[PDB]
Paper text:
The preformed [name]-[name]-2 [name]-[name] complex digests the T35P31 RNA substrate in the presence of MgCl2. To obtain a stable [name]-[name]-RNA complex, we substituted MgCl2 with CaCl2 in the reconstitution buffer or introduced an [name] active-site mutation, E191A, to [name]. (B) Active-site structure of the [name]-[name]-2 [name]-[name] (WT)–RNA complex. Ca2+ ions, green spheres; catalytic water, red sphere.
The N-terminal [name] domain of [name] improves RNA synthesis fidelity by removing misincorporated nucleotides or nucleotide analogs from the nascent RNA, whereas the C-terminal N7-MTase domain is involved in the 5′ capping processes of the viral genomic and subgenomic mRNAs. The [name] activity of [name] is stimulated by [name], which binds to the [name] domain and helps stabilize the architecture of the [name] active site.
Residue numbers in the entry:
A (entry chain B): 2 to 454, 465 to 523
B (entry chain A): 1 to 131
The structure:
Amino acid sequence: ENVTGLFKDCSKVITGLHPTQAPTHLSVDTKFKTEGLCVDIPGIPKDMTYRRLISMMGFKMNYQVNGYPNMFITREEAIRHVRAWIGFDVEGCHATREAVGTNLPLQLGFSTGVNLVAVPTGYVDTPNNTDFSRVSAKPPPGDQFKHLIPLMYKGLPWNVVRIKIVQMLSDTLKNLSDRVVFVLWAHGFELTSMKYFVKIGPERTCCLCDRRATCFSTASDTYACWHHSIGFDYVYNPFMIDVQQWGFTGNLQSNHDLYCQVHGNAHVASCDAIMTRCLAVHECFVKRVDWTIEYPIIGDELKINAACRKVQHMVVKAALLADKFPVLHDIGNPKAIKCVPQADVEWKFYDAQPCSDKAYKIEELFYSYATHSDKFTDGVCLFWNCNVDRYPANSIVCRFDTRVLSNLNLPGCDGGSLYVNKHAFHTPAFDKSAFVNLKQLPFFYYSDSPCESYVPLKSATCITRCNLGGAVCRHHANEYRLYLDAYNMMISAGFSLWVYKQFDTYNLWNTF
Amino acid sequence: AGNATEVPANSTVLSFCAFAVDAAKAYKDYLASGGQPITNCVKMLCTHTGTGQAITVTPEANMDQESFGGASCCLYCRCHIDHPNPKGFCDLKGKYVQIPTTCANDPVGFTLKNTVCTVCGMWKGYGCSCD
RNA sequence: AUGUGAUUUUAAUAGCUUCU
RNA sequence: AGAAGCUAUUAAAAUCACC
Ligand SMILES: [Ca+2]
Ligand SMILES: [Ca+2]
Ligand SMILES: [Zn+2]
Ligand SMILES: [Zn+2]
Ligand SMILES: [Zn+2]
Ligand SMILES: [Zn+2]
Ligand SMILES: [Zn+2]
């Protein structure tokens, strides 16, 4: 055989091409082809007016060059860039008049939620150049595709839908990352649709800047980072990844709909690229959090984690010292790191799975409500960052509220979201039905540190012996304001604390 | 539908050169680092006895040269991107190209690096006698 | 007046080899 | 002249994905 679908001439002219103005030997007509070496017949002249729609279908980016990065990546280098995933699915239209045989791209769709229709435009090989221009097309046949019937009567030329892909990518990935990982399901028509807006080249650096160069400008032959790309039309080096080569057998809607019941309305581009990114977040993160892959520091990563550690250190000691629990359980704590070491409770580590150490004899147990509703009755069970469907009636829960969108909280599978902060936590959907045995937590600060000797602050929330009197000391006012800052920055970050029913803030007062 | 043009040996060089901001530099870098030249060029069965010229309407091949079809040596014509020539017209497409036979296993890499002497129409340095 | 492919089959058409 | 096996050229069908 030894043929490829690439650059396949899709005209319906019966004749071939002249010896010149023919790209390869296989495209010359039979009148000239003799023993693999074409002959110049002076009688037959060459065509001077003709148009042939070249088919840009079947690109194979398996090149290995020294300076040039590879497009396709291995799934140990795509999990390290998870802030830069943008799903991609393209719906096509077939060329019907004066050209047959190629699927021109009609509708581009991203995980951002933006459908960009384009006019059908193909590479027409004129006598003097390759005239990138509009070809005639028909939308696909059948009642499966009927919402592409109006789209061919609208759209934009490919010099405005090349700048509304670099005005959308640049506004999505401005703060997440400095590259783009195009998660594609097909690995075919998408590459065909990336001839139009992608130019790979040597590894470059932004003009008058320092970030990686990810946007090309054809008018002024320069490069840009994601912040300075206003008016720049060609996407510089992307990375892509094919989800069907991860061992999937079947349609897309018969492999997404086994994990997620929130997305739908398939064979629309934004709902093929959302299922394509949903399934690819599932196949990498929903199994278990991977503690080996660190992540860069986008912003507020140091303060949020230390504030969470501060409030988790605070609330547990308060509930333990207030209610005098004999034993305290723990669930989902991967290592054994005692949050409050100066305590009397016995820290039974009912971990999910043993993680890289047995020095502290961490127990192995998975939690589900209908399974373990009557297993733990003694004490209180610290479900810090646990993912169980429903929590028991005695617990101190901190669950990430997955309806808040930020540069940390990437969207994820089954309405739950991917909270990528120095690690990747795939928290499931935040439903109210999980908290039917719990209540919210009031805001308060409690410390046993003796008072040492500025604006006077009067708040009944703070629990110290100085604020119980008339004068509030300066050895507790800065403590209360720092704790309030940590608490409000955490709640703004998206966590949500929950506590058992019998939590009484007045039980803490009689301890003094 | 359609009449196939390429072979799977050239696809890995065509794809990588289809996406490039500069088509000439990328082929040279492919050639340096473990790269097989572009096969399937169009070759002319000339009488192979003729006066030498770089680009002609009829194949004029000297005994130390091979005349190829000028559409399979221009890399820009060959990847279907826009020529960098002013007026956006390929110079080589339509006319019969000539490549010295010592380097005519890879025509496209000859027409990217070399140039044509303006006063005598020969390949400069390859038989151009302009001392 | 036939959308891209890939993998199977099933027919024919070319060779290459063996046997009758 | 046929059979058997192998590799290829074309055509039809089946299954699968993309549309
Ligand atoms: Ca697709
Ligand atoms: Ca699709
Ligand atoms: Zn910049
Ligand atoms: Zn989904
Ligand atoms: Zn004090
Ligand atoms: Zn050219
Ligand atoms: Zn000269």
